[PDB]
Amino acid sequence: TFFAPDAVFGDRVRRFQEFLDTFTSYRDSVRSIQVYNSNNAANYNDDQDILPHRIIISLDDLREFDRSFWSGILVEPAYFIPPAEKALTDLADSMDDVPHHPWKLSFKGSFGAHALSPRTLTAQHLNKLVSVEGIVTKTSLVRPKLIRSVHYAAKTGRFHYRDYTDATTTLTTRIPTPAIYPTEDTEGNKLTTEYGYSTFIDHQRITVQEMPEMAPAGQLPRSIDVILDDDLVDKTKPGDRVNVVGVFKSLGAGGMNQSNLIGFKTLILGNTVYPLHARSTGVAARQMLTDFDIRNINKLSKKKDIFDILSQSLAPSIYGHDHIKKAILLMLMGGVEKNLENGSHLRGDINILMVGDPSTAKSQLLRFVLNTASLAIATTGRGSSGVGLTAAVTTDRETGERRLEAGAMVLADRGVVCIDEFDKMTDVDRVAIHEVMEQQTVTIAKAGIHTTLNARCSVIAAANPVFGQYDVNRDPHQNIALPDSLLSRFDLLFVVTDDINEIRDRSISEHVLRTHRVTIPFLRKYVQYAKERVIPQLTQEAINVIVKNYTDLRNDDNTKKSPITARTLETLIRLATAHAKVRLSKTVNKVDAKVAANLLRFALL
Amino acid sequence: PLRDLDSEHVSKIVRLSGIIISTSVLSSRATYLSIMCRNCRHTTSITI
Amino acid sequence: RDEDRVAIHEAMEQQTISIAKAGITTVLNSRTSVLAAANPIYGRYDDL
Amino acid sequence: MSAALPSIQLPVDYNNLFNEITDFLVTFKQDKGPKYMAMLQKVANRELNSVIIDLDDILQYQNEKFLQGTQADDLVSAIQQNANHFTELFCRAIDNNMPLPTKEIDYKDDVLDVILNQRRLRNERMLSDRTNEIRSENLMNDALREVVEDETELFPPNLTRRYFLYFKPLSQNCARRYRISSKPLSVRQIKGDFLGQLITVRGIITRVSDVKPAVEVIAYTCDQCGYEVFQEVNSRTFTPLSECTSEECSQNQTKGQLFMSTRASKFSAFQECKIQELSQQVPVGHIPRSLNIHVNGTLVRSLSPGDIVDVTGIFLPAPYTGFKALKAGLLTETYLEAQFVRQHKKKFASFSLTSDVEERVMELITSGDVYNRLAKSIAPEIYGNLDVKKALLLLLVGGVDKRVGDGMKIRGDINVCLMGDPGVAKSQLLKAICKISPRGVYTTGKGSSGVGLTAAVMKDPVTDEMILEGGALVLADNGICCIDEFDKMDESDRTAIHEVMEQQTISISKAGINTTLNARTSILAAANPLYGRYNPRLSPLDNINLPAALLSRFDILFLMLDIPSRDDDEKLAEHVTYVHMHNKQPDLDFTPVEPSKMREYIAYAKTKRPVMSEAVNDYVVQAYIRLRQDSKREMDSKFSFGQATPRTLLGIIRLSQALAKLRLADMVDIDDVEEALRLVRVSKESLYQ
Amino acid sequence: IHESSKFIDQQFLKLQEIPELVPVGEMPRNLTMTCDRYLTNKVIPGTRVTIVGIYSIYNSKNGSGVAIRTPYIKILGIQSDVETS
Amino acid sequence: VRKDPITKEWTLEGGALVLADKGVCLIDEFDKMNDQDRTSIHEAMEQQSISISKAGIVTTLQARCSIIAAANPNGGRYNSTLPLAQNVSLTEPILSR
Numbered sequence A: 001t002f003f004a005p006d007a008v009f010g011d012r013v014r015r016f017q018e019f020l021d022t023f024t025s026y027r028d029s030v031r032s033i034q035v036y037n038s039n040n041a042a043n044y045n046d047d048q049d050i051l052p053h054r055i056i057i058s059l060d061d062l063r064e065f066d067r068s069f070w071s072g073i074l075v076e077p078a079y080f081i082p083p084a085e086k087a088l089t090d091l092a093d094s095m096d097d098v099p100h101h102p103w104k105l106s107f108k109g110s111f112g113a114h115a116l117s118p119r120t121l122t123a124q125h126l127n128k129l130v131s132v133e134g135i136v137t138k139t140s141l142v143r144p145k146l147i148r149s150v151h152y153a154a155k156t157g158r159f160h161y162r163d164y165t166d167a168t169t170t171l172t173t174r175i176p177t178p179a180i181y182p183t184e185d186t187e188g189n190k191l192t193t194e195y196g197y198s199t200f201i202d203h204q205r206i207t208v209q210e211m212p213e214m215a216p217a218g219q220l221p222r223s224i225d226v227i228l229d230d231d232l233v234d235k236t237k238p239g240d241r242v243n244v245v246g247v248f249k250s251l252g253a254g255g256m257n258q259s260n261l262i263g264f265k266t267l268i269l270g271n272t273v274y275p276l277h278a279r280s281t282g283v284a285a286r287q288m289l290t291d292f293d294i295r296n297i298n299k300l301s302k303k304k305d306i307f308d309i310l311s312q313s314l315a316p317s318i319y320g321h322d323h324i325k326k327a328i329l330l331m332l333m334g335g336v337e338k339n340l341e342n343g344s345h346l347r348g349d350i351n352i353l354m355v356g357d358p359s360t361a362k363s364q365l366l367r368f369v370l371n372t373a374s375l376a377i378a379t380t381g382r383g384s385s386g387v388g389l390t391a392a393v394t395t396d397r398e399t400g401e402r403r404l405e406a407g408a409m410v411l412a413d414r415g416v417v418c419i420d421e422f423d424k425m426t427d428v429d430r431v432a433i434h435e436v437m438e439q440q441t442v443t444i445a446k447a448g449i450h451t452t453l454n455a456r457c458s459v460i461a462a463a464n465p466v467f468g469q470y471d472v473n474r475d476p477h478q479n480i481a482l483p484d485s486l487l488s489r490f491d492l493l494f495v496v497t498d499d500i501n502e503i504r505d506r507s508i509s510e511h512v513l514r515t516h517r518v519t520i521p522f523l524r525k526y527v528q529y530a531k532e533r534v535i536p537q538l539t540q541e542a543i544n545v546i547v548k549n550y551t552d553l554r555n556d557d558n559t560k561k562s563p564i565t566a567r568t569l570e571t572l573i574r575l576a577t578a579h580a581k582v583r584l585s586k587t588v589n590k591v592d593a594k595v596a597a598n599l600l601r602f603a604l605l
Numbered sequence B: 001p002l003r004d005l006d007s008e009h010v011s012k013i014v015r016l017s018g019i020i021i022s023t024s025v026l027s028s029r030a031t032y033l034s035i036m037c038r039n040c041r042h043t044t045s046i047t048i
Numbered sequence C: 001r002d003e004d005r006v007a008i009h010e011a012m013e014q015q016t017i018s019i020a021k022a023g024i025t026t027v028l029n030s031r032t033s034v035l036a037a038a039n040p041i042y043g044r045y046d047d048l
Numbered sequence D: 001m002s003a004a005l006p007s008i009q010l011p012v013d014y015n016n017l018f019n020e021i022t023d024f025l026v027t028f029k030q031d032k033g034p035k036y037m038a039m040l041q042k043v044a045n046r047e048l049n050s051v052i053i054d055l056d057d058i059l060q061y062q063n064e065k066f067l068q069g070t071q072a073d074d075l076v077s078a079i080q081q082n083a084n085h086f087t088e089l090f091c092r093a094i095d096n097n098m099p100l101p102t103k104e105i106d107y108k109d110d111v112l113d114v115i116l117n118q119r120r121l122r123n124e125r126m127l128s129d130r131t132n133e134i135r136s137e138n139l140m141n142d143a144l145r146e147v148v149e150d151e152t153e154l155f156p157p158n159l160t161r162r163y164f165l166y167f168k169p170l171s172q173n174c175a176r177r178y179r180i181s182s183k184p185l186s187v188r189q190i191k192g193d194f195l196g197q198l199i200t201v202r203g204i205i206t207r208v209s210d211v212k213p214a215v216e217v218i219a220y221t222c223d224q225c226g227y228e229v230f231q232e233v234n235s236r237t238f239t240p241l242s243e244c245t246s247e248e249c250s251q252n253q254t255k256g257q258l259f260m261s262t263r264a265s266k267f268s269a270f271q272e273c274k275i276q277e278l279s280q281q282v283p284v285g286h287i288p289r290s291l292n293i294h295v296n297g298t299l300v301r302s303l304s305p306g307d308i309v310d311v312t313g314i315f316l317p318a319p320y321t322g323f324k325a326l327k328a329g330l331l332t333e334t335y336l337e338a339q340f341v342r343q344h345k346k347k348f349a350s351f352s353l354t355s356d357v358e359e360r361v362m363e364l365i366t367s368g369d370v371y372n373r374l375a376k377s378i379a380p381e382i383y384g385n386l387d388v389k390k391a392l393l394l395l396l397v398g399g400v401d402k403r404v405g406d407g408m409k410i411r412g413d414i415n416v417c418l419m420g421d422p423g424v425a426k427s428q429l430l431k432a433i434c435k436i437s438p439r440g441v442y443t444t445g446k447g448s449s450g451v452g453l454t455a456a457v458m459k460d461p462v463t464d465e466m467i468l469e470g471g472a473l474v475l476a477d478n479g480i481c482c483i484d485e486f487d488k489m490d491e492s493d494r495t496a497i498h499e500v501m502e503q504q505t506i507s508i509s510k511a512g513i514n515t516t517l518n519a520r521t522s523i524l525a526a527a528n529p530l531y532g533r534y535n536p537r538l539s540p541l542d543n544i545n546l547p548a549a550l551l552s553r554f555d556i557l558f559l560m561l562d563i564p565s566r567d568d569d570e571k572l573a574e575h576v577t578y579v580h581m582h583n584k585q586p587d588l589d590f591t592p593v594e595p596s597k598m599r600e601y602i603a604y605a606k607t608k609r610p611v612m613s614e615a616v617n618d619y620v621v622q623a624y625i626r627l628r629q630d631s632k633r634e635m636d637s638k639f640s641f642g643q644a645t646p647r648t649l650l651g652i653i654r655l656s657q658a659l660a661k662l663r664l665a666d667m668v669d670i671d672d673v674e675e676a677l678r679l680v681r682v683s684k685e686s687l688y689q
Numbered sequence E: 001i002h003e004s005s006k007f008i009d010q011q012f013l014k015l016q017e018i019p020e021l022v023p024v025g026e027m028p029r030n031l032t033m034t035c036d037r038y039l040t041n042k043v044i045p046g047t048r049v050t051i052v053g054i055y056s057i058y059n060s061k062n063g064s065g066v067a068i069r070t071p072y073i074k075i076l077g078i079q080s081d082v083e084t085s
Numbered sequence F: 001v002r003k004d005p006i007t008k009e010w011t012l013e014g015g016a017l018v019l020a021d022k023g024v025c026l027i028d029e030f031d032k033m034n035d036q037d038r039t040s041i042h043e044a045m046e047q048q049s050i051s052i053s054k055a056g057i058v059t060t061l062q063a064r065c066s067i068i069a070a071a072n073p074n075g076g077r078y079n080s081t082l083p084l085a086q087n088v089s090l091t092e093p094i095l096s097r
């Protein structure tokens, strides 16, 4: 600022300008931001009558371009990042030329040895750039921080201002300036504070501990503190798998100054943060779509046989049961989750129960779903050692003296839960599920907390017949061994049989041998665009079908093998709506109701 | 054995055995630090 | 024990253990074989 | 070094916005006379204590300028910023132009209004003597009077301030009319850098402190001077200014001591609360985080726990950071200083009648059939079954509380169970009545419900005392508590509930708790038989798992159970598919009433205290004996349930009172109990289908 | 000037007398143990070891006797049973 | 692995079977024990080493210790008309060690 820039800085700038001149992808992107802000500014300014100023750099573009500048960011970021942002802050002034703040950087890619788990983040290579992967373990209450303070000198109507700097605003150890908050003017007058002409920024620290499946298990966790400036504050939450990049500063002067041992305070200045996805995580896969990927979906969406092949392509590892995995595919699609005006929300999620002879795929099918649903969590049921899959214990020692944490089902707020060995799971959870299933709300009433939290999520149940095996010559209710309301709460109950034979059993050997000796990645991208864009309204061509069938089964099935209730009316709507989503249909059609009937014919008879 | 440790031979080399209970944190200590006077604008270095 | 068995009862056939406590949501590879020993005691048929 | 505290300037110019205020306070007649001056006459009358300033008037005042070509110099865009300046300067004008007192000072008045009067009088006598002494010392108003003012030292006008000043924003209507200022923000949405602004936030007020005094100015007495010393207190803490700062002791050898006066010290009523995020506004996967609200003055009791409110107020820093090491410099805590409150479910206790609410009642009445209109207007999103929903309206209006005038009390309230099988919706009716009931609450079978139905005891965060924290039956009172999965509760829950249906109170005698506690709640319960659905081969005392002693405290139970049928299920399937085809309810020659206007109607009916005619009195008796004789002598076999009791006779009376209140009628007819008995019997005729 | 300074890792270990051979009457005693540079992370809690070290003396901010010091060992090298468990 | 108050010091307390690894553990009222303090002796008899996998420490501790166990018949009277495994509450495999 006040000192005269030396060539060791002036070069770094103009050298970085030849990079951005070469890779226009960044020059047009910063422009694309001030396109967006001015459209909103015009929207605010010119109808009533932002994006947080950072760019991600692919480090692959530096390696081939400027080898010593590659090593500079990694080995000496404090001498190479402040000038690169100083270039961009004048590139931004070059792209715009409308009338009239900082601009900042972020990175992506491979850092070699410098990407390491906090198990091996050590007091070697402190100042170097680092990447760390792990669980975000807690987050601090996002405090506002002072930078500029503003005052009024009422004797004159002048305004005065003061500006603050500290250990976390520059990578280099700027000379400290412990300035004093001005309660009196230089002349001696009184002052008052113009709160909100002053400016503020969010401070947060989050503490990351090593990812538990890579961890050499048995050892203790080890964790380090990451400080986030204004931007990334909103994009971390405890328990998610997170990668951070930053500078592992070693600040203060403990021991050697003041008096006495424990060494320097070590932390990362977070300049990039990404959530990432791993098994049983609180975030979706969220694959990006090209304008090409959408083209393939639209080629498919009007072919009159996709649902049969798509239903099959799920699980080549398993033979048969197309009639079931049809429905599990429909669970990924779900309903429309209609929320009514001045009256309570109405369920969209379809919840499925699998039961059958213990030889079957019940435990294995769920590891397709858990591996290929957008968001899923798996629970054993018995072994939910907290309150359950939903609620949690609540206590604190930190400054606020209370905190909350969420169970699996509150974390899985929209997606999937895999529940298996379902009838092991005790009444304490089952009666809590009766709260959830058709209300999708959770209530607790501890000493301090008396409040309602959402759980708009979908369930697979897997169960075993209590007698060890079942066959249809034994009356078909008592084998279910659950309260009749749960047999209502779950929407489709499928009974899988293997009283052995030979004819079908013949083919199985060569299919398994072929299995030891359409595809998955498109389904995710097929489902999410369908989920995001498509919201089928009903159509009269199908509203009659759901009345004909539902009204007949209550005459027939109440004289036969299964119960029928007004609960199973709406399950017809959801399943019809789901198949229309498979069609990407802007509206429901009669064919979807005929499919809804078919799935229940197989499930009931 | 620790039972035979004594104020005798303080700061000699000692050979002893046991079980490690715990391993704490990899605290950070200096070995080179460079230092400036905030008023003299004057630089030195210290090594340990 | 019932809380023990249900995990191994899965890990013997899908070689992972999935945990659902609020604190952390792990799914960790077991990667184990089992050699087991058991007794025929109470082979005598009754239900109670 | 004027490069320190460097000078800057900005488009504001407070030195003539004060010149705008001094017109607005007197130049407004768009709604006695210039109403702010007449309101200030009621301050000069000493009959009100708080001033509410609305942006609704400031905007239309600027239109009367701007459309006359006169510069606005906008206050509104300034005032939504930086309101801690205006709220301590806008009030200065009012000191400088207000009417003189008219009802002369008298003993039957609040004691603070003579203490201020005496200092205000003493202020003028000091000018009156000093001017005459100056004039008498051997030799023009504007010349002289400024000498008096500077040489004197006086009580400041903030210490003579009779009143507390507050603001309320302008609603969206006034923002779109004449074409921002108050989006009701989420506690998550606040994004920090709004510090300074006037903001609106809505959410659950989970927890409040009790009101207590917190000092704003300390007054100190010095004998050897006779001058008072006033210390402004601004932070959470102060140190006693024991060393006498007086103008008479400063230029003196002895610096004699002083003592605080604990009534001359200007206080304010201080209260604070948490608002937790409103749950439907929480993102996916995230948690309802909390914000801290501070209150000063006359507003203080407007916030009560377990209710939903808009808070409007000014959002500000507080100096706190953690604990020294867990720090990165110049951090701040933050709080909201509350200015005005409105609450989406209103307090029944405020219900007076004015030019807009009577016509909202009258237009509801004149269509007639009001009782059936409101029953169908309760939960019209679920099919039929009107007898249940028709009784839920009586649960709200509740009947009459009776005090014997002789040390006895009997419950003026309705307790009901909704027994049945799956598929005939229950929680939707429970949830619908939780919305339509102010202070309504929703509960569940298992987990916390021991403490959750009980007083906890808590070390109160803000101040060094223990407090009882109310579970559902205490977080609700004078209102509905909703219970679900009912029989999946346990004996420790029931033996709390069973006492609350019988009488208005709870009693505790474990650990630090020994109190007797007021419940005053209506319990509305949903429960399922032993096998989810009924079994026709089981008599109801065996089909139902509940003990008949507790059941006798339900004044009605509904055997609300389904049987399949060829026709009736068709109309249901129409209503569900219609209301799922779109939000709208059926095209009947009807309208389902808006809930808030029904809440106003109920709040008026609650005021009615009906009396029973002797004609019905002798009819209720004879019907009871025939019921009780039949119930005992005939009905103790097969489908027979329970026994008739005195309690069911009182149920019929309370229901008969409720009907008469829904008529808005001061007396109870023979026409009422012949309806009440029908609901009692009809609730089980379902069993014969 | 942190950005032109070099730092090293050190670690605190505790060793206790093997519970297989200790007085019946009381708990085992233990020693604070420290190590520097490449000697860090070589050892896992619950392994059996021999330490060669400097038995040394430091002052502890106790709260111990009228005037006293606390013993500690600076490890200057380490070895083990070839791998525990 | 459990607390010690002074300095909040952490150390193992071994079982008596570790404290007596060369010699003998003397157990009084052998029947009157729970789950955990039964599986411990059974693991020691079975294979003479005791696992630890708690508080972040993983170890197997030598428990090469002999036992003299004292027990009482269920109901005090020996009931000589029934075998010992029916007279005592203990089952044969812990009894056969």
Ligand SMILES: Nc1ncnc2c1ncn2[C@@H]1O[C@H](COP(=O)(O)OP(=O)(O)O)[C@@H](O)[C@H]1O
Residues within 6 Å of the ligand: A317, A318, A319, A320, A358, A359, A360, A361, A362, A363, A364, A365, C013
């Ligand atoms: N329908 C099927 N087709 C092929 N393999 C199957 C089928 N059902 C079960 N399996 C076999 O069972 C194993 C998975 O265990 P599984 O039988 O699903 O356990 P569980 O009975 O607990 O569900 C796999 O190795 C798979 O080969």
Ligand SMILES: Nc1ncnc2c1ncn2[C@@H]1O[C@H](COP(=O)(O)OP(=O)(O)O)[C@@H](O)[C@H]1O
Residues within 6 Å of the ligand: A346, A347, A434, A438, A485, A566, A567, D381, D382, D383, D421, D422, D423, D424, D425, D426, D427, D428, D572, D576
């Ligand atoms: N008669 C009806 N009219 C409209 N909707 C109904 C009706 N019966 C059931 N429903 C639907 O079924 C659900 C009711 O579930 P419910 O039966 O209350 O659970 P529970 O078994 O705990 O009572 C609601 O979402 C509602 O939309």
Ligand SMILES: [Zn+2]
Residues within 6 Å of the ligand: D222, D223, D224, D225, D226, D227, D244, D245, D246, D248, D249, D256, D258
């Ligand atoms: Zn004095």
